[PDB]
């Protein structure tokens, strides 16, 4: 059985913790629930850690007092199809292989599934670790609670004796790097300096051997990513988000300075040896838009190249961990701002961006966002009980499973079927424009080999490559973004029509140039 | 927000509680969750209570950390038909009125329904308080969570100015007495001596005015009836049961001495 | 009403039948249930047949004493979509037409449906008989019991006055030949010599006019294909299977000599005029793996060409009726062993294999096969009754319709939804790799015309053709195989990654060669 410790003894040194813990709703929660610090207390000084205390990062540390929220979080949505490749005719991007050629996502890019699986899915996807990590067997794919208990309870490593990234299976890639893990787990929260910069107190950084880092990590989406364990108050912990909002002064709502002030973020820094080490962002309100934006954003978490001279930008560079914090129509400028692109297209040679799941930046300026609606209202609503204590559902999933709470309490004029119909109108329309955008991208791409072999000039090919950047950006935003336009239907429409326009321009350019060589 | 108290100071005078609390699974649960003892600590000695500390009896004192158990408890089973009289041809005892004639249950004996309603149902049944207590209106019969929050949030008293048992409706009885309440609530656990014997320290006893007692009671089936709040371990609190099992030496399983 | 005959009179001549009938569970079943032999008994000698007895091949011969098994067999699974073409974006092989160009399957290749329809579906598919045979009208497609009663109760022939294979509809082929019928019916079991070799006692053989043969055949999947009618014991009758297992000594489990001995096959030969004529394979156990492998295998049942010199291999050659009895990684060697390929690709010119439904060979070595599980456990389980005599379901179909019996009695740790989720994880992953394999095959194929027209050398084109063989094999196995990887997920993964690797090699080869000509 747990035996409480004297928190006043800790507070003698830990004044920041005192200030947070004594005031919030965890003022009665003893440190022993999450820390084993006996040897630490025997050896520490006011400025030197001494023996390092044990800190629990497992989600079951919160589940004995918050079982309802834990059990809701760990539920597996079986209707969220697992390991479903997006580059197929029945998924999100039928022509993805042709369009993404040259990028690691060509090796595998599946649709997302329930949050319990995020860390194991990261470890086992074919693009990440060369096939090094696999489920122990094909039964384990069902085991959401097991994944939550720990990744290494359900996975194997093909070679525990080596730590290099290499291919164990032929059609895999080794794109994983330490930055990725920040959106899968925060088990490393005490072992990683802010931004992954080199730091004498950090075991891990942007330049670490990612296979070694992986082996030290266990739990997905820790409860403390959104809730400070000491104050119980709302927060974020993701460095790239704090960097955008606070360090670069862009605010929580870059398009709305008033909402940014009302729903702001305060950066709190913790030190090692009286040097800044790590940071958190305390929120003014329990604002899920910003909580979810720790991960559901467009980012850099990877090496790339400079737009200016084509030189390599490695993991050592700050730009390898970057939140652009820009909507689709501001993105090209944001990428120019840091002089960065992701890959050269394998067929066209164009410098291209790689977009990823920009839900937060897409939601900005939408009708729902402008009306004060937030991610949680549609994706983790309050539970409705005939008789009971209300709590917030932590099963983050499509509103289709809980339409009464997610939509119909606000939209009293609609039945469930009417609300579903409105979602599908947008998704069907948007998907049609995604498909047409891909058709035109593909038509352009297929002209590049013909143009090159016919002797079309480098100047014309470069003009077409410049068009390819924009045609790509204004399409791929929407295959990356998970709502198929629902989050901002007018923006999707405008973007996708722009993509098509750019590809059509490039097709005309290249056809005319080819025809002139004949 | 709750601010913790120095439990070690309490333990200087409460060794009995110390020995339970420090060993069980509530060793880390601070006393402020269930007690307001500030004025008590200012005035007590080890031999003089001083000001009486307040003890929470509401079930929400436990629901903060044990929401799943609380929400499962308070659920209303709508399929358990409510206010269904047993002396009818389609229930348990078609000839009950003839057979029970002379007993108070002839006035009303319904089938049981969900636990959330036990205290309110005891208060409102036609055989208990002469019809003195009623739901505020006929809508309130659905409200299990409200009954749990407290009986007097959903009921009315026909005459707050009197405390005698009497008939307010013609075909009622006044069979309720203080012993009944021990199987409806334990809000009175610190105000009732063992067995309801007379005692200098007990506000309430077997011989109390049941209408006065009723007004001091709020919550059904308290969580601590089965779980010691200090050790978190399994227990019973009902005096009659302890008296049979232990005092009279009958054991927990009178037909099986080994068990 | 049936009147029994004196079986002892038959047994005077038919000692093999006596030995089987008197010992098994049909010892009390009189011959009149299946044979009308009165004139035969009047005219036969110990060595000459005399007048031929009538033998019932209809399944209703078994249905008066085994109605439960018959009615379960003839059930139509309406959820098994009928006449659904695989070369469509929503089915198994979105790029099949490009990849299979030059082969008859380009004319039509539908997904399988319920067993009742196998013979009629064979007769009416657009690739088989030039459109000669059709359902009497479009209502008849529903009539499973009617098809079982006889094909010619529900079909018409466009020209009863001719027996040649020809096109009656423009976009049909005439690929059917007599070997095909052995996996649709055994109505011809007394009229077909072992392997379809020429034989004086056989009405039909590999070289027969298939339209004439077709007209003599009526019933699908006869009950006696798995059960000897005389002993009632487990058996196979399919010649190609017996040839692989017994004649070529490969065993019932080629990868496991111990299991092969425990679960073996004994070849029993019947003669005409004291010359070997036909054969059956009695099984040691009621082993559905081997029963189902009469048909659910990769085979030759068709003419082809030799790998060595390109010469034609006709129906007259034994190789036209062949069970390779080899897993995907042993297949190329098995095809080299008989010096055979199926077709030349219409665009690339490569010699290619044609694969068909290799469920048995894929199942070998899988986790389930290694644990002693067999096809029937998942596809025709025992019925579970609260009160009743248990029998074996004969409705061979997906386990999704009977998950409690097919999966959950063994997998007590799972709910139905969890088990379904595990199936879909494998199928989704495998299908993604099938689609990627097709993308890379298509990319290679499309380079052949460009390379040929640019003047790339025959030596380079032949190197690419050799790669095409392997890229094709390691893809097509899996579009042919019906489990979308479930039967052997690790093997599918390895094969499909090999396909992609081979195509990528060919693409690089051809692009570099084209670029060198410019
Ligand atoms: C003064 C002698 C200290 C006492 C008393 C306690 N801690 Fe401490 N701790 C101390 C230092 C100098 C540091 C390094 C950071 C800093 O503020 O300079 C720490 C660090 C921790 C940590 C972080 C550990 C890690 O892995 O990074 C934890 C979780 C921690 N301390 C907890 C803790 C507890 C619970 C205490 C009471 C039992 C306690 N500390 C006392 C110095 C001192
Ligand atoms: C029991 C010993 C607890 C442990 C372990 C954890 N929490 Fe907690 N939490 C506890 C209490 C008694 C309360 C107050 C309840 C009330 O409403 O009065 C809380 C509160 C929270 C909250 C709400 C905070 C707010 O609204 O300001 C959150 C978000 C929360 N707790 C989160 C949480 C996390 C993430 C935990 C694991 C790190 C955790 N709690 C543990 C009691 C206990
Ligand atoms: C936060 C800014 C992220 C970083 C850094 C990385 N990932 Fe991610 N990932 C993130 C989200 C919000 C999602 C769900 C939404 C979606 O569009 O999928 C994902 C999903 C994945 C998946 C599952 C789906 C798939 O693509 O197969 C995998 C396998 C995955 N992520 C891997 C991965 C890798 C290898 C990363 C570093 C190169 C990486 N992620 C970083 C958020 C974020
Ligand atoms: C960010 C993605 C979150 C993670 C990770 C966790 N929770 Fe959460 N929690 C989140 C939100 C948006 C809210 C609602 C805030 C609002 O006021 O609208 C909550 C709330 C809670 C609470 C408070 C009581 C309630 O409303 O249910 C608790 C006790 C709580 N959360 C606990 C908790 C646990 C145990 C988690 C890990 C399993 C967890 N949260 C993760 C957002 C996020
Ligand atoms: C709720 C979770 C509680 C916590 C935490 C503490 N106490 Fe308690 N206490 C609680 C109840 C419901 C009662 C009523 C009696 C019962 O057995 O249920 C009590 C009673 C006491 C008493 C009176 C004992 C007696 O002589 O009759 C004392 C002296 C007391 N409690 C002290 C105490 C201390 C010092 C605590 C912190 C260490 C403490 N309690 C916590 C409920 C809860
Ligand atoms: C949070 C501040 C709590 C309050 C208020 C209450 N309980 Fe509790 N309880 C709490 C914890 C951290 C634990 C240990 C969890 C673990 O498994 O480690 C418990 C445990 C219990 C138990 C189980 C005891 C056992 O198995 O020995 C019970 C029966 C229990 N708690 C009951 C209970 C009651 C009735 C409460 C109101 C009087 C109550 N708890 C409050 C945390 C908290
Ligand atoms: C514990 C030994 C009890 C005592 C003392 C009293 N009651 Fe009770 N009551 C008890 C239980 C276990 C049940 C449910 C099972 C059942 O057979 O009903 C009840 C039920 C009631 C009801 C509801 C049903 C009904 O009869 O209408 C009422 C109105 C009720 N009890 C009233 C009541 C009165 C007036 C009591 C003292 C005279 C009394 N109860 C004592 C357990 C116990
Ligand atoms: C609006 C046109 C109503 C319709 C339709 C129904 N009810 Fe009603 N009900 C309505 C009002 C304005 C009130 C009084 C509210 C108050 O607190 O003053 C009620 C009351 C009831 C009651 C309580 C009756 C009592 O005597 O205490 C019940 C049990 C009730 N209503 C149930 C009910 C049912 C089941 C209905 C559909 C058959 C129904 N009501 C319709 C307003 C309206
Ligand atoms: C000896 C005079 C015979 C008697 C008595 C019966 N049969 Fe016969 N049968 C005989 C021969 C020589 C042959 C040819 C095969 C052989 O063993 O050499 C047969 C063949 C059959 C067949 C196969 C017919 C076909 O179409 O190929 C059947 C089904 C058959 N015989 C059945 C049968 C029955 C049921 C008899 C008792 C009524 C019977 N035969 C007697 C020789 C002799
Ligand atoms: C009635 C006159 C029968 C006819 C016609 C057919 N079968 Fe039969 N069969 C019959 C009996 C009395 C039995 C024995 C039942 C028992 O369990 O004792 C059987 C048995 C079978 C079996 C099981 C054999 C075994 O387990 O060893 C099979 C597979 C079987 N029968 C198949 C079958 C076939 C395919 C038939 C048509 C060719 C057929 N039977 C006809 C009775 C009768
Ligand atoms: C046994 C080794 C077989 C031979 C010889 C032939 N077929 Fe077949 N066929 C067989 C199986 C096990 C299946 C079901 C599984 C599947 O993948 O479809 C089939 C299916 C068909 C179908 C229906 C599906 C379709 O392709 O449209 C048809 C029309 C069909 N078979 C025709 C056919 C022809 C023309 C054959 C000789 C050239 C032939 N089959 C041989 C097993 C076997
Ligand atoms: C009576 C008013 C009818 C309605 C309503 C439907 N059908 Fe019909 N159908 C009808 C007749 C008289 C016939 C021809 C019968 C014959 O054998 O001469 C049919 C035929 C069909 C067919 C076959 C078409 C073919 O070209 O062979 C089909 C597939 C069919 N019917 C299906 C069908 C459906 C699905 C209906 C509801 C949408 C439907 N029919 C209505 C008469 C009538
Ligand atoms: C191979 C593809 C089969 C065909 C064709 C038929 N049956 Fe079958 N049968 C098959 C198996 C795998 C089994 C189970 C064997 C085991 O021991 O696990 C059976 C069993 C029977 C039985 C025995 C009683 C029972 O278990 O139900 C009978 C009587 C039977 N089969 C009859 C039968 C009929 C009438 C068929 C044509 C409609 C038929 N079988 C075809 C495999 C195969
Ligand atoms: C008992 C007769 C079984 C039947 C029926 C089904 N399965 Fe099975 N399965 C069984 C065993 C003994 C094992 C291996 C267990 C171990 O850990 O050693 C399995 C394995 C699986 C797997 C994993 C496959 C892999 O290659 O890792 C899966 C996905 C699986 N089983 C699913 C499954 C399904 C969906 C079933 C119904 C169609 C099914 N199994 C039946 C035993 C038995
Ligand atoms: C992840 N991207
Ligand atoms: C069939 N093939
Ligand atoms: Ca999903
Ligand atoms: Ca990006
Ligand atoms: Ca009841
Ligand atoms: Ca099918
Ligand atoms: Ca073949
Ligand atoms: Na989905
Ligand atoms: Na491995
Ligand atoms: Na009932
Ligand atoms: Na199907
Ligand atoms: Na016709
Ligand atoms: Na093309």
Swiss-Prot record, chain B:
Lineage: Bacteria, Pseudomonadati, Pseudomonadota, Gammaproteobacteria, Chromatiales
Positions spanned in the full protein: 33 to 291 of 553
Residues the record lists as binding heme 5: 115
Binding site for heme 1: 10, 13-14, 40
Modifications the protein undergoes after translation, according to the UniProt entry: Besides, it may lower the pKa of the Tyr hydroxyl group.
Organism superkingdom: Bacteria
Gene name, Swiss-Prot/TrEMBL: nir
Subcellular location per the Swiss-Prot or TrEMBL entry: Periplasm
Binding residues annotated for heme 4, in chain numbering: 223, 226-227
Recorded coiled-coil stretches: none
Residues bound to heme 2: 31, 34-35, 230
Organism: Thioalkalivibrio nitratireducens (strain DSM 14787 / UNIQEM 213 / ALEN2)
Residue sites binding heme 3 per the record: 26, 62, 65-66
Subunit comment: Homohexamer. Dimer of trimers.
Family affiliation: Belongs to the cytochrome c-552 family.
Protein task: Catalyzes the reduction of nitrite to ammonia, consuming six electrons in the process. Has very low activity toward hydroxylamine. Has even lower activity toward sulfite. Sulfite reductase activity is maximal at neutral pH.
UniProt-annotated binding residues for heme 6: 180, 183-184
Protein's name in the database: Cytochrome c-552
């Amino acid at each position: 059985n747990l035996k409480p410790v004297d928190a006043m003894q800790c507070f003698d040194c830990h004044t920041q913790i005192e200030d947070m813990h004594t005031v919030g709703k965890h003022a009665t929660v003893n440190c022993v629930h999450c820390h084993d610090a006996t040897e630490h207390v025997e050896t520490a000084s006011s400025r030197r850690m001494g023996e390092r205390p044990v800190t629990r990062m497992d989600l079951e540390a919160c589940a004995t007092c918050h079982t309802a929220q834990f059990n809701s979080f760990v539920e597996v949505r079986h209707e969220s199809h697992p390991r479903l490749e997006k580059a197929t005719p029945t998924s999100r991007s039928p022509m993805f292989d042709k369009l993404i050629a040259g990028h690691g996502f060509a090796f595998e890019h599946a649709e997302p599934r329930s949050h319990a699986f995020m860390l194991v899915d990261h470890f086992v996807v074919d693009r990440a670790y060369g096939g090094r990590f696999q489920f122990k067997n094909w039964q384990k794919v069902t085991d959401g609670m097991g994944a939550v208990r720990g990744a290494w309870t359900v996975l194997t490593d093909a070679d525990p004796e080596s730590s290099d990234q290499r291919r164990f299976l032929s059609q895999t890639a080794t794109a994983a790097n330490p930055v990725c893990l920040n959106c899968k787990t925060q088990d490393h929260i005490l072992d990683w300096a802010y931004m992954g910069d080199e730091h004498e107190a950090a075991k891990w950084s942007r330049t670490s051997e990612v296979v070694e880092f992986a082996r030290d990590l266990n739990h997905p989406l820790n409860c403390f990513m959104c809730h400070d364990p000491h104050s119980a108050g709302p927060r974020v912990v993701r460095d790239g988000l704090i960097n955008a909002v606070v360090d670069r002064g862009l605010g929580t709502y870059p398009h709305d300075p008033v909402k940014s002030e009302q729903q702001g973020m305060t950066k709190v820094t913790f030190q090692r040896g009286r040097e800044d080490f790590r940071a958190i962002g305390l929120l003014d309100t329990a604002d899920s838009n910003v909580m979810c934006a720790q991960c559901h954003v467009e980012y850099n978490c990877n090496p790339g190249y400079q737009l200016s001279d084509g030189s390599r930008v490695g993991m050592d560079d700050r730009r390898a961990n970057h939140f652009f914090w820009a909507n689709v129509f501001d993105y090209k400028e944001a990428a120019q701002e840091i002089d960065f692109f992701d890959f050269r297209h394998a067929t066209t040679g164009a410098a291209l961006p790689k977009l990823q799941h920009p839900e937060a930046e897409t939601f900005w300026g939408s009708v729902h966002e402008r009306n004060g609606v937030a991610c949680a209202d549609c994706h983790m609503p309050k539970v409705q009980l005939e008789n009971g204590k209300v709590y917030t559902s932590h099963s983050q999933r499509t509103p289709r499973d809980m339409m009464g709470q997610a939509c119909l309490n606000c939209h009293a004029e609609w039945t469930e079927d009417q609300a579903l119909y409105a979602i599908d109108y947008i998704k069907n329309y948007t998907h049609g424009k995604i498909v047409k955008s891909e058709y035109w991208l593909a038509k352009m791409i297929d002209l590049f080999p013909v143009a090159k072999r016919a002797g079309v000039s480098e100047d014309v090919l470069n003009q077409a490559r410049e068009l390819h950047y924009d045609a790509h950006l204004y399409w791929e935003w929407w295959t990356a973004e998970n709502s198929v336009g629902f989050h901002n239907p007018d923006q999707a429409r405008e973007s996708l029509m722009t993509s098509i326009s750019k590809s059509k321009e490039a097709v005309s350019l290249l056809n005319d140039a080819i025809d002139a060589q004949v």
